[PDB]
Amino acid sequence: ATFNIQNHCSYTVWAAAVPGGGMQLGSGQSWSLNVNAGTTGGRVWARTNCNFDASGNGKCETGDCGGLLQCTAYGTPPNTLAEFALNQFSNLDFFDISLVDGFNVPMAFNPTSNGCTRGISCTADIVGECPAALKTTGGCNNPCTVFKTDEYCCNSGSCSATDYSRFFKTRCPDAYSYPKDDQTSTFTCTAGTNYEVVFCP
């Protein structure tokens, strides 16, 4: 499958993918990423305010993946996430936008083939609106990241929405706002669909 990863922000971002790596995308530039059929735990995200040396080692203000330009591991919150698992049960791809690891950059994540048309977006000014307890440089953290309790992180107990998850959910109703926000955040397409991930759509 092909992911068309497009930076429509006026600022440069450093696109990241696992599997895939990462590259600098100036405003208006795009990356076509091949993603094999059957991939699980897939993510695409943007990183902000990075500075990398000649060998691809360095730092990003949001979404840093172990100091690498070409990510092999997930990024450090906050990072708006396009998540996917391809060719799963019932001849389906499963995909979502997640704010469970926070928000940095607005995002659309849409199918582009196979007669799959229903996509996803989170475009609110979540950084400008972020509550004080969640705010950080370049982003808005999920309360699981900030507080690290089961109320927000749901390893055990009864996982329900919280005022801090609801902040994200009412502003981006399409996206996961807390770990068990499954019922209203799950998108599917026929297996084998292509996708776009657009920063600042």
Numbering used by the authors: 25 to 225
Provide the publication's sentences verbatim.
Despite these low concentrations, proteins have a great technological relevance in winemaking as some of them, the grape pathogenesis-related (PR) proteins, can aggregate to form a visible haze. In this paper the crystal structure and some physico-chemical parameters relevant for the haze formation mechanism of three isoforms of TLPs isolated from grape juice were determined. Plant TLPs generally have three domains and a cleft located between domains I and II.
Domain I is the largest and is made of 11 β-strands (β2, β3, β5, β8, β9, and β14 on the front; β1, β4, β10, β11, and β14 on the back), forming a β-sandwich of two β-sheets. The two β-sheets are stabilized by four disulfide bonds (residues 33–221, 89–95, 136–210, and 141–193). The short domain III comprised 33 amino acid residues (residues 72–105), and includes a long loop and 2 β-strands (β6 and β7). This domain is stabilized by two disulfide bonds (residues 74–84, 89–95). Two disulfide bonds are shared by different domains: disulfide bond 89–95 connects domain I to III, while bond 141–193 connects domain I to II. Isoform differences in heat stability have practical and economic ramifications for winemaking.
